[PDB]
Amino acid sequence: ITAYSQQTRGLLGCIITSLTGRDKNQVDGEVQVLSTATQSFLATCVNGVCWTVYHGAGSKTLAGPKGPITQMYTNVDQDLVGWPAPPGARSMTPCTCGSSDLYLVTRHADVIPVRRRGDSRGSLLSPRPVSYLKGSSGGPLLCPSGHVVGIFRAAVCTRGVAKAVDFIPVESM
């Protein structure tokens, strides 16, 4: 698995788009880099829904070509929200080959190995600074074949080093 990223907006434009709800940029790729005023996170497109963490998006709309997109799925207890994916996003497919060495795609488009530990827990195969994972919530956890098994929720860390991640299973989507 490889990844590369492409910024599409700067600061002024993010701000105004948030107030208008109206996104006329052409959308593409599997994973959207999102921002509000408060934070920046990711959304994984899986079966034509853009998914992301509830602790990031809250219950807010997603700016779209025609104006704000209402959440179609809002689960506060699973920390999961979903918007109808904007046209152009590349939709991933949920894994089922059931592999257990997994791949976390970050905001910096690195692709870090994660050992599946349980339904929605993983251990990093080599420690990263947690700072490096900041902004990656919502990102995809991939199996070797490129399918999605979930989206990053939370890093478990001590003294600044992320050892394990918590994730929301694709199952729950």
């Binding site: 208008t20 807010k60 997603l62």
Partner: peptide
């Protein structure tokens, strides 16, 4: 206001 897409990640 809205959540805004400010970039993307392409998967290979």
């Amino acid at each position: 206001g809205s959540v805004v897409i400010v970039g993307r990640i392409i998967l290979s």
